[model samples]
Structures are given as structure tokens and as C-alpha cells.
Target chain A: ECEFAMRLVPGFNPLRQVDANGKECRGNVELPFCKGYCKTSESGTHGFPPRVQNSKVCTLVTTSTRKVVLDDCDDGADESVKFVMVPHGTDCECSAVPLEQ
Target chain B: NSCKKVGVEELINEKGCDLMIIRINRCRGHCFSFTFPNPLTKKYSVHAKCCRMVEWEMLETELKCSKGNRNLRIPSATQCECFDCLV
Candidate 1:
């Protein structure tokens, strides 16, 4: 079965980031994370020892990024704080990721 | 890979005589690929999966002919899987 949904992801949202230059920021930003399952075939193929195995899984597809200004870091003027490219998944599908090397 | 049975005519015929039907197993399927950006190098990381043959067996055959007998060696797929696609 296949379905789609969104959930809170602590890995990306409300994240604590540090810039390459030692600049840091902590923001309470909540982003939507793609969550769902798609119809897939892990052991769909059937045969003897000699056969094929093709499998699929639901994973992130498309994502949109947001920029955040590392608060508390006093920049002399109001420019852009070293932006944090926090990626949040917007779309997902049944795909074959590098599950193994 | 799927084992398919086909008639000799579909594949080939020898000396006006229909040869043994060939049972072929081949790699056939779809694989997902992805590319993600890496700001560290301003480049990108690429990942492409593929469905291909993993193990195979060689089928050696000798065909009779008036002038000379011809030797045929064919690689038959023994196993297949979705693996890291060589880019």
C-alpha cells in the first residue's frame, strides 16, 4: 500500500547550527518532514538460487531550504547572518537508495 | 532477471531445422537515482542505483557444420540484484 503524510523532524527543524567561521544560532523553527510508505517489492521475485532481487522503499525526493539568521550573534549592521541551509523534505516516492555498498 | 522461454524461430533456426528453444535469463528492472548538493565543495554527491546481473554461468556449445564445427560460448545470468550503479 502507498500513502503520504508529514511529521515533525527534530533532526532538521529547531536545529542548532554553527557557521564555518564559528558563528552559531539556535532557532525554534519547525519544518514539515515527508513520511509515508509506498508499494514496493523486496522479495517479489521468486525462483531458485539463481534469480533476481529488486526492492524499493519510500524515501525523500524533493526538498525546499530555508535561511536562518543565527540570533544572538551581534552583527554590527543588519546584513544576512551566515545562512543555514536546513533542508526539509517536500516530496517522497518509492525509490531505491544505496541501501548497500 | 526473469527466465523466459521462446521458440527457436523467434531467436534463430539452423539448416532449416528448428533448434532447441532457448531459455534466457536477463537483467530487467528500474532503479532510482538521486543527487544532493554539497556546499562544502560547492559540488554535489551523486547516487545511482541499478538493476544488473551479479552472477553468471557460461554455456559452451559446439555446432555441427559441413566445413567445420563452430564453438559457441554464452554467458547465462545466475543471479541479479539492485546494486550501486557504476557511474
Candidate 2:
């Protein structure tokens, strides 16, 4: 719902530092950048970049767009990818070992 | 084996085995148990008490208390049939 923008440079990892508009910012501080150059950090821990400005030296990039939704979280900010139980067939059999009474 | 792939209709037609239908209550209270028509046969059972009521609620869709895991046994086995079978 935010309209902020930025100008990202090639090979500029938002995890380290980048120029947003006229300001030199470190980490992905909300700013809208165009041209698909801003990417998530190697650890996949960062916020969506601000999309406020479009600079010639800036490039917009995205690594992964898929997200996990948590039912407990209202805003969906706490969403994280998780696993669910999926049953599969097995040949193992279960029985009691007989003992002489 | 290729001999085991025969359908149910073929078995009923060829073999003396007849279709028998029986219903048993699977869940009573918090315990799930299974009862069979023939009491002399070896009976198999397990206790699956679990945390998280909602998580256990999912098991109710396929598993019943009085009947065992229906899906685990063969689909056509008369004695192997179970009312509540976990899919």
C-alpha cells in the first residue's frame, strides 16, 4: 500500500548498502525501485524495498516472491514457510509377539 | 504378482467369497478402538492420544475409535475392512 521508490545500482546487495534516491542507505529500508535489481539477501531476510522513486542508476530486482501465510497472524507479517504432514503407504505390519502362558 | 490384480467382481464371481457389510463405532470418549465380527482372530490396536485438539481433529476425518485404520488394510479384504480408516 506504500508508494515510496528508490534507485538501486547493479551488484548492490541491499544487505550491505545502497543509494536510495539521493540518500545512501544500508539494508532494505522501504523505497520503491524500478528495473528489477533489488534482491533479497543471501539469508533471505529482508523487507520489500520501497517503491517511491526511479533513478537512472537504480535497478529493481527480486529473488523470491512466494510467501508463507500463517493463520494466527492478522497482518501476515509473521508468515513463514513451513511443512505439513502428508501420509504415505508402508508395507510394515504390526502384531503382538506371542508368549506361552 | 499379475494374479493378485483381479478385481472384486471377478473374485466374487469366481471364488466363494461373498460381500459382507458391517458398521462399527470407532470413537467413544477420547479413546479410539476397533471391534471385529470374529473375536478369535488376532486384534491390532494402538493409542494415539495427541496434543493440539485441532491437529487431532484432522485424524477424525479418516480414523474411528471402534474401528482401526481402514485405509491401511486392503480395500477389498472382508476381514481387513475397518470403519475408520486414516487416508
Candidate 3:
């Protein structure tokens, strides 16, 4: 069985970036900054930044104060693994599983 | 859908053994904003739960392979179900 690592960083959104038209911008831009922003890749190629890329390591942010959550790093990797985000001040348990063909 | 269920009946039927199901939960978001050093250069963006309470069920098998009796086995049995933002 393949092993994977998981982590959580408070107050950090890796996918948060500026968008102008179909192109993605960071640092600085024209008037009104970027036309708009987005969470997924809809903003462009730079959008929907992935935490883990086939490395068996994934990170996720929590919105609610206390809640259980799960996500997929389904972009790359020969085997598929899910990110299990548990509430803070609680036990964090993460494991890796095989991806069915 | 608020709640979703995934059945592993096929796995059990194919493996012909007692299978164990393990559920995992995770969440992700892009709710953040920042500015650069440019006048009249303000950008607007959107953020929400990219992956909210998504669950993955993995199947576990208890099969043994001894000398002169090797058989095929399923390495992993996990599937993910996710939903995008709805406004």
C-alpha cells in the first residue's frame, strides 16, 4: 500500500489569485486591478491551483469553525488519494487508498 | 445532493470475500483576496467551497496467498464525489 501525507495551514488560500480576461495575473496589473477573480480554473490556467500533484501530499483550508471535510487530488498520481480535513483541536487521521482502474 | 451513498456490492461479488468499507472526509476553499502596488488596479474575484464534505469510501479485503496458491487481488477501492460552488 502506498503512503501519503496531509497537512493544514491556517488562513492560507493557495488558489487565491488575480484574473484579467482569460489570463491570470499576480503581483500588479492595470486599472481596476484584474477584471475579476475565481476559485476554480474557470478564471484561466493559473486558476484552481492544486496543493498536491501526484506526490501523495495534499493540503486544504477550512471555512467553518468546526466541521469534517474531504477532497480529492485527482489531477495526477498513479494511485488516487483523498485529503481528509478534520476540525481543529481534534484528532487528524489521514490515509491513502488505491484507485480502481 | 446533501447526502450521498456509494454501494460496494460489486467489489464484494467480484472478490468473493468479506469487504470492509472505510469513509474519509475532506474540504477545500479559495476564499481570499489580496492587492498589489498599483493605483486603480483593483481586481474582483469569487471564492467558495471547492470541495465540501466530500466523502470517499475504500474497500478492504481479507485474502491470503500462500505458496503454490497465488491469486489476484485488488490494490485499492476508493472513489470520490465532489460538488462545485452554487450561487
Candidate 4:
């Protein structure tokens, strides 16, 4: 049962900033992160072979992003490269890893 | 207690694998789960911190395969904690 949800994941920098083409040439923004607990299967019963205690966790399955624009720049960089993508975790679920071969 | 280490039997078959343990400890029990609203986002969501092994040890032992016997090391849960679920 790995259910996903948006949490107020924090970082050293919480404030969004724009380069503004001022002295700096970049921008940054914070986003919501997906996290939670998932279900697990029991193991290590002595006689039980093959099946051992396993690990699972909650994580994002679907995600999207928003635009962040650095308004000012040092070299008057083209506006074409000024826009950037910021990630947002949109959905969550409990899942076991390594279904992939 | 929600989660604890327990002593278990030494002989068992898991699907096809045959195991014989000299001795072992395993983690067992359920974890608490809840849901709440984000103060700013006002979105409701579930929080589940599953119980699992935070520390473990693989013990050396003898095992049997379909064709032959071999030496192997299997794990035992030494410690545990509730943490974020993995992707």
C-alpha cells in the first residue's frame, strides 16, 4: 500500500529567485515532493527459503513541472534560454522495486 | 509493540529454495498509518511509514539447490525503523 501525496519538502533555500539578467545568470524555485510509507512482506522464518524479508517504500510515479524565468542577466543572454523547468511530484504510490529484469 | 525482532524456526522451504538456518531473528508486526491535510496546500494525503530492518547481518550457512548443495550467507534483521517508502 504505497500511497503518494505531496509534502512540504524543504531545502536550504525556500525562496524562489530570478537571475533578472542582473549580475547573475540563473533562477531557482522549490517544489512539492512525494513521500510516504508502503506495505511490506514478512520473511526470515527459518524454514522459509527463497523468500526473505523485503523492502518497499512510497515514491512518486507521476510528475510535472513549472516554468521559472530568470528575468535579468549579465551578458544579456537570449530570452530563449532564460526559461527553465521546475519539477513537481504529482502522484504517489506504494511499490516494490525491481520488477524490471 | 508495532515492530519487533523474533526468533524463528530454522528449517523451511520458500517456493523452491531450501534453507536450513543455524539460528536467526526476523522483523515482524504492523506500523501505524494516518492521513492529514497540508496547511497551505489544503490537500489531504496518507502517511505510511512501514516497519522494516534498518540493520541486518548475513550469516554463513549451508543450503541446497535443486541439483546440489552449496555454502551461502543469509540475512537476519538486527535492527529496524519506520521510514519513507521506496519508489
Q: Give the best candidate by lDDT.
A: 4
- Could you tell me every candidate's TM-score relative to the true structure? 0.39, 0.12, 0.18, 0.45
Regions more than 4 Å wrong, model 3: A1-101, B1-3, B10-46, B50-60, B66-87
What does the lDDT read for residue A10 in candidate 4?
36
Per-candidate chain B TM: 0.60, 0.17, 0.23, 0.61
Q: What would the C-alpha RMSD of candidate 4 be, to one decimal place?
A: 8.5
How many clashes show up per model? Answer: 0, 30, 12, 18
lDDT of 3 by residue, A1-101 (tens): 11122322222222113233333222211111111112321110112341221111111122223222222223332221122122222211111111000
What does candidate 1 score on TM? 0.39
Model 1 clash pairs? none
Cα deviation at B16, candidate 3, in Å, is 14
User: Per-residue lDDT for A21-45 in model 2, tens only?
Assistant: 3332233222223221111101000
Off by over 4 Å in 2: A1-101, B1-15, B24-87
* Residue-level lDDT tens digits of model 4 in A1-101: 43444433332133233344543444433444445434453444334473364544444554555565655455656665565554445565544432111
Judged by whole-model lDDT over C-alpha atoms, candidate 1 comes out at: 0.45
Per-model C-alpha lDDT, please?
Answer: 0.45, 0.19, 0.23, 0.51
Candidate 4, superposed: residue stretches over 4 Å from native: A1-30, A40-53, A68-82, A95-101, B6-23, B29-87
Per-model chain A TM: 0.51, 0.15, 0.14, 0.46
Tell me the tens digit of each residue's lDDT in model 1 across B1-87.
232221111243577343544444555555544443333333334444556666666555555655676665544556656665452
Better of 1 and 2 by TM-score: 1
Model 4 whole-model lDDT (C-alpha atoms):
0.51
